[PDB]
Design a protein around this nucleic acid. Structure first.
Ligand SMILES: [Ca+2]
Ligand SMILES: [Ca+2]
Ligand SMILES: [Ca+2]
Ligand SMILES: [Ca+2]
Ligand SMILES: [Zn+2]
Ligand SMILES: [Zn+2]
Lengths: 352, 552, 552, 352
DNA sequence: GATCTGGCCTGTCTTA
DNA sequence: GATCTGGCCTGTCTTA
DNA sequence: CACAGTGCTACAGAC
DNA sequence: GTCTGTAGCACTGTGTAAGACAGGCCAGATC
DNA sequence: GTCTGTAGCACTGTGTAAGACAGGCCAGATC
DNA sequence: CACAGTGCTACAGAC
């Protein structure tokens, strides 16, 4: 079953903002993307998350000497590169949006470097140069890793962006549009990107969930901005790395799941659990969903949700990320006078 | 008889009358002696639309990059098309603004009487002289706390406000050629409210760098678009070409650090204008050159991001001199007179406190005796100098405290008769150099102090080094550093310091509160839209001339 | 072509124009269209001295005891001759006032027109009927915090203020006999600012019982002197005799307890009007008669001081029902509508908070759970009912919160459908009895709710007893007790409750702040002397008629 | 010599006001006269003062059952009735001014009743009725006890009062005048008072120090309100109790001391020490003075003052009372923003 | 069980 | 060394 | 059942 | 037919600090 | 000679929250 | 060297 326990943020509630990332590296979870530019208390901007005794504590992580430093991107595409040859195990980030609202259009590989001493870990970030046909600066898109024969590539798809520089006006400045619906194959070196268009992917989407397994990627419910619809349909994409041009085919599967901005926590070998973003523009999704996927296709079954508190049930918005091994963290904005100033109440939900 | 709608509109605006109060008076004066003297309300609503932005036709050559060519836009919401999806960053903001160049056109066209008379007094003629106008614009921006929130409908909004404004300082002409430029109009009271025109209002906290940049992005884009084009305006019957120089100087130190990518504010790197560290500014107190610029901060944060030499955090920090955030707004490398005054006054307050008790002998005092010394100092400054103790140092207290007689009222408490001479000498040294950064033009109205500044600051620094080393062994106030090391070259490069202060903007905050309480609809959806317009009217030269001219 | 000085003085006072702003407008309207429409400043200074206290000649019969017979005194300092020896209690106070009876005859001579009109329309004639006039005066007093202190000269003064005011409610006649009294004038808006005349201004804290009694002593002496005499005033050409009935009702409960010798305020003795203890007022919630009076409190503290039966502290306190201080000012035994509203609203707020969480099953929750419930309640009341959360409960929030739709917005959070209807029934019961204590005249406005009050309050009390016993086992708030036990006899003894509320005085505090900021000399020696006079002018019927009569 | 040590009031700051009394009973000192009416934290209004470890602590004292309760008088005349027959040892109070500024005109005998248990003391107050020829309600006056062969009586003299009820106006309400300069002999029972007029006492005075010994009373420097002068002359008055009318004679002595509102702490058998009130209306007296008095007369010698702190030297006003055995407590008003809210800084001065 | 080191904590400083 | 009791301390309530 | 506004937009009354 | 005056809309500000009291616990004094 | 307009006086309000950094200490991990 | 007031009292200028 599933249980939620309320947490308490001891001395850092000023760092979490609706768009942030939680990276599970070697069992340790790292918060990435904080409000504002990195202060001097933590000049890196990446924190180690430790949950214990109903408390949520954050620790300042440092980098290595050969690493490039990193702006706190807000809604980047995040791909867990799993431990394999050559060097395990990266965490691909591209590209999000900057504290001053630009879009990065840069790829960053984030790995673990050394330990300890006293449970101290140093990370490292290689900003990997991209030669293409590079994809445009965007956010809300998704990035996934695929293995075929037995080469490893990275598929990139979706996202929003600002209007083209020709139509952009100081009165159009903050309006966003979906990028054209092409898929990008990023080799990780050679740092060569290729763009491929698909007859069945007729319009772009954003804030979808992408689940990859062994040379097949399944795109679940996204949000289409042109028609203002949340499609129930599921996309299944089959790639294959032929020397030397990547032939690539697509298909629409009948019914998937109507969600946007979800939390996909992994529980099993290739099985995840969806904790829910939003069904409609006014109604956040309150039900859980188990999604295991195999060689035959996707499977999907209802799980019973936990006893949602009145507060987390009547809240307008919510967000969070997976703490790993069937556990995730959710946040709720708080309203009070005076300011608490703890901006968010925190819960930890766990499956089994 | 009957008054011109312009005259009575100026009457209504310049005397802080409400619309409801003005109507209350109009009907009354119209019922006794039935001949109506004041105009009704609707004709004033018709009278003002020539004074608000979005009325005159203009054009830029060449066209402005990514700025629309429409010239008739009025008040826009500053969200600028923020798509309101739920998965995106929220639209937490209520903000209103004028589109920058349109408001510029409006203020310039408002200055047309003075531009023409400035042309005629220099005995320059008019068929001539339509090609080389140069306008110098002082910009200003400041946050503002304690803004009570309405009940309204939505959305939930913070209780702080940010207020971006500007003012036209000078406007000159360069053609025929040899002349540097013949100034034709210049602001007589640049630190007044009546010459600080509002541009954009937001219910935003200063601190959230995410929403503030989202609001102020378009404005900075228009600024960067205007530096190349030339405006063309039919002023005095003829089409004339203008160019613009923007100098952002109305920022306190906190905002300058926030907007130039520097770390704030009690850092190891203290100066906004130089690269010297805190301890390094104890040894050498008076010898520092201005090196920092927006160009170079932009160039340096790329060093921070890419880290091309693969150094650790601290080696990188000192290689980059504390630039770890991307600078977002170009800021003139200068000083703020008002906040400098207040900072140096609070420093001298602490020095007096440390001289009542003799902390140069007993280096570690308790907390209760420091409080005791505070009490005795405040009681003495209440008996003489007629001051009450203040929760926080403000400008008027700073002005009355840094006088000769106040120091002499303090010396009556210091027992040792050589430290009395010491801080008395300190105070007159300080007074021999304050007018250089407080004057509107120092080279004209205090020239000898301007030339004697280097030597005076030298002696000030050495008095601190000798007779107060227990306090300034390795620590200095940032404003003390600026006051002692950078004043001459600033006044030589720009011409003045006090003329470009943040005084006028803070003065406009007063009007913000007044208007919010008495001159706007009481709703979240409309109050900013009203405060902006009425504030723009109150700061119009054309409406201000009706007050002065029909007296003298 | 020309305005009457009275007309334009009313124009300037009623529209909140400062003297400087009015002059700024007058010169302008006088230089355009040269013929001066408004009057200059000095003629208005001359116009108003007929309206301020100290202008008309009067006399009391018999003469007032220990009150001087001079009739031309104006603004006095309230210190009343405090000898300024250093060994004595300090003269910490800046205070100024009108001498009571003089201000009374001024406010009465103000109502000349309305007295004559009320005489003529009830068809009574005037050679007749000059013998038995009766004036009913509602007096009111309240403290006020957050009053910033000026630098000035001296002396050091607190940052709080006390403001004693009064208002003329009704004036009737009883000549010749059988008739109870034929009301000839009565206040149409008694809770408005325009009918709350200031008397006494002090920079004093409510709490210091030493200085407040020293300043308010003479005023209470004058009040006690006026209950005996007859005033004689030439109104309508004839000398006429007036009587005065004073009813002090504009006091919040804290002030009433301070002024009647009772202990404040969460005592074991809760009621100002009855003797029942806190626990005793839980078992029986609706059956209590009014017993306490000023004379009885006076004779009870004699018991406390002399202790004639030689009992311990607690036995004596029980004997005296908590009268351990000497009562200093007679106060009418009534209720305060505004503060009662705010108290009951905060109580219902707490009840909703304790229904979102189900604290009738889980009797002891944590503090973070209570904070979480507060968060969810405030968010719900922001979505529907469109309220922001408030630091403190104020009147407007109380008005919008105790509606039926707000309770239904809360029930959406209460899980199980029995407590839902429980508190819904509670709210509609409460709304069936609110208008009885907030109507200006309940017997005419809402007569059936007046009739049904006993039974309604009975059911309210029993609902509390039954399904909220977890909250009201032995604890009740004082205003709940007053609201449930004393309303009917109050409204049957006095006639109304809402007409005698603290609303007008609190409304005048707003004017105090306004005029201190913009209508007075900025000095400690003069600010009160100006606020008092301008406030007295702003609340004059004679100047307010020029606004309405010259429209319709 | 003499030493001053700064104290700290731990929690009692709102109770001490410029005019208050410190009564030394059986070694323990009691503060009497607090700001406002008695709260429920201490329904008596009398506190026990304990100074230790640089802290000043107040403890609520209770009364007996047969005692009358007592308004917090502000400037009453205070006479230490010493332990003798019949009942020791009382403390005479008459009459001060009430929280609402009336003058009491009542006489209260304050004695100790029982102890302990845990260093708990109960007092008692008998409002002694006065039959006369009673003195008028006043304050700032003085009261002393005298013994002559060997009957005991109390001399009462000086003080201010409100203007007569015939000339008192609501514009004269707070102005005070010195009451006529008669001396009142109060027998302590029966409570028969008698007034006597003296040819050499032409004008009334207030805020003077009265030192009594063995049927002679010495009135030191007072304040005359008619001429606004502080006389440096000393009055010495000699009483004698012959039934039935107490013959009574006076004399002016050459020079005394020009002070008002002083602190007379006892150090010896019949010798006190004066810590100083005010010399002139603008200049508080900063020097100490030893005053021993004998059968020949009064003697007077200057002692060295303690090293006055800058705060207690530049203060405008000050007050306090004798803690006994050559020790006294002084208080200084404090100025700050915000309010401390500790209204007074405290010092303890001690001789030898 | 002893030793080391990272990170937490407090107090002071600097600008608001 | 064990026991008792007064008074201090904290938290909740009631009005502002 | 506080109350006097806060400014703008519609919509009648008035020649 | 232009000019003029008011009704509708949704919300504003004045209402703003200590004291009472019950229960638990500890420290200091006595047997 | 009445009426009128301004100078003198002493003081007002707008300037209002977190972050940096050095030193001490403790807890948890390793030898 | 902020600056536009805050109201009252004197003291000139103007018919
Ligand atoms: Ca600021
Ligand atoms: Ca500000
Ligand atoms: Ca109050
Ligand atoms: Ca109040
Ligand atoms: Zn520098
Ligand atoms: Zn009752």
């Amino acid at each position: 079953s599933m249980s939620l326990q309320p947490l308490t943020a001891v001395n850092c509630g000023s760092l979490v903002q609706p768009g942030f990332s939680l990276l599970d590296l070697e069992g340790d979870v790292y918060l990435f993307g904080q409000k504002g530019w990195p202060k001097r208390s933590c000049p890196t901007g990446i924190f180690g998350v430790r949950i214990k005794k109903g408390e949520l504590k954050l620790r300042a992580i440092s980098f290595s000497n050969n690493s490039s430093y990193l702006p706190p991107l807000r809604c980047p595409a995040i791909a867990h590169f799993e431990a394999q040859d050559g060097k395990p195990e990266c965490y691909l980030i591209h590209g999000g949006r900057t504290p001053n609202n630009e879009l990065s259009s840069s790829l960053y590989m984030l790995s673990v470097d050394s330990r300890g001493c006293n449970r101290k870990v140093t990370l490292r970030c290689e900003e990997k140069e991209l030669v293409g046909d590079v994809p445009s600066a965007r956010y809300g898109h998704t990035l996934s890793v695929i293995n075929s024969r037995g080469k490893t590539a990275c598929v990139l798809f979706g996202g929003r962006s600002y209007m083209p520089p020709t139509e952009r006006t100081t009165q159009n400045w903050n309006s966003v549009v979906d990028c054209p619906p092409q898929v990008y194959l990023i080799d990780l070196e050679f740092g060569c990107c290729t763009a491929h268009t698909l007859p069945e992917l007729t319009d772009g989407q954003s804030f979808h969930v992408a689940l990859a397994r062994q040379d097949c990627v399944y795109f679940l419910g996204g949000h289409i901005l042109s028609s203002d619809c949340r499609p129930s349909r599921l996309i299944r994409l089959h790639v294959e790395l032929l020397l030397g041009s990547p032939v690539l085919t697509c298909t629409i599967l009948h019914e998937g799941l109507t969600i946007t901005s979800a939390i996909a926590s992994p529980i099993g070998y290739h099985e995840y659990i969806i904790f829910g973003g939003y069904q409609s523009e006014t109604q956040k999704r309150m039900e859980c969903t188990y999604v295991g996927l195999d060689d035959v296709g996707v499977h999907m079954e209802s799980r019973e949700p936990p006893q949602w508190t009145s507060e987390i049930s009547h809240s307008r918005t919510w967000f969070g990320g997976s703490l790993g091994k069937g556990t995730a963290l959710v946040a709720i904005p708080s309203e009070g006078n005076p300011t608490p100033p703890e901006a968010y109440h925190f819960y930890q939900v766990s499956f089994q | 008889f009957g008054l011109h709608p312009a005259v009575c509109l100026a009457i209504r605006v310049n005397t802080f009358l409400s619309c409801s109060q003005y109507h209350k008076m109009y009907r009354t004066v119209k019922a006794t002696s039935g001949r109506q003297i004041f105009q009704p309300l609707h004709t004033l609503r018709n009278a003002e639309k020539e004074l608000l932005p979005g009325f005159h036709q203009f054009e830029w050559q060449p066209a402005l990059k990514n700025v629309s060519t429409s010239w008739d836009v009025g008040i826009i919401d500053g969200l600028s098309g923020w798509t309101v999806s739920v998965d995106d960053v929220p639209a937490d903001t209520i903000s209103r603004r004028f589109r920058y160049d349109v408001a510029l056109v409006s203020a310039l066209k408002d200055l047309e009487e003075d531009i023409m008379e400035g042309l005629r007094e220099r005995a320059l003629d008019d068929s001539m002289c339509t090609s080389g106008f140069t306008v110098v614009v002082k910009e200003s921006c400041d946050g503002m706390g304690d803004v009570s929130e309405k009940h309204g409908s939505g959305p939930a909004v913070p209780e702080k406000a940010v207020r971006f404004s500007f003012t036209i300082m000078s406007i000159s002409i360069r053609l025929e050629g040899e002349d540097d430029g013949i100034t034709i109009f210049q602001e007589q009271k640049p630190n007044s409210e009546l010459s600080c025109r509002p541009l954009c209002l937001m219910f935003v906290d200063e601190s959230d760098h995410e929403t503030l940049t989202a609001i102020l992005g378009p404005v900075v884009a228009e600024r960067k678009a205007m530096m190349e084009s030339r405006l063309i305006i039919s002023v005095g019957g003829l089409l004339r070409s203008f160019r613009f120089f923007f100098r952002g100087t109305g920022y306190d130190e906190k905002m300058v650090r926030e907007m130039e990518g520097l770390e704030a504010s009690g850092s190891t790197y203290i100066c906004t204008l130089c690269d010297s560290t805190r301890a390094e500014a104890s040894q050498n107190m008076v010898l520092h050159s201005i090196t920092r610029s927006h160009d170079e901060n932009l160039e340096r944060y790329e060093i921070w991001r890419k880290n091309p030499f693969s150094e650790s955090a601290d080696e990188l920090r000192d290689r980059v001199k504390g630039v770890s955030a991307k600078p977002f707004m170009e800021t003139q490398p200068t000083l703020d007179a008002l906040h400098c005054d207040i900072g140096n006054a609070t420093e001298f307050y602490k020095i007096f406190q440390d001289e009542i008790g003799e902390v140069y002998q007993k280096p570690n005092p308790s907390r209760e005796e420091r409080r005791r010394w505070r009490s005795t100092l405040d009681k003495q400054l209440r008996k003489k100098m007629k001051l009450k103790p203040v929760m926080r140092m403000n400008g008027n207290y700073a002005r009355r405290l840094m006088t000769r007689e106040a120091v002499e009222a303090v010396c009556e408490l210091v027992p040792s008769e050589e430290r009395r001479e010491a801080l008395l000498k300190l105070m007159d040294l300080y007074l021999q150099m304050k007018p250089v950064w407080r004057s509107t033009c120092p080279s004209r109205d205090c020239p000898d102090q301007l030339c004697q500044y280097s030597y005076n600051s030298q002696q000030f620094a050495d008095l601190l080094s000798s007779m107060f080393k227990y306090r300034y062994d390795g620590k200095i106030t940032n404003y003390l550093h600026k006051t002692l090391a950078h004043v001459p070259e600033i006044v030589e490069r720009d011409g003045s310091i006090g003329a470009w202060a943040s005084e006028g903007n803070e003065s406009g905050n007063k009007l913000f509160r007044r208007f919010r309480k008495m001159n706007a609809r009481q709703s979240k959806t409309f109050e900013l839209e009203d405060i902006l317009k009425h504030h723009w009217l109150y700061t119009s030269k054309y409406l201000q001339k009706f007050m002065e001219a029909h007296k003298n």
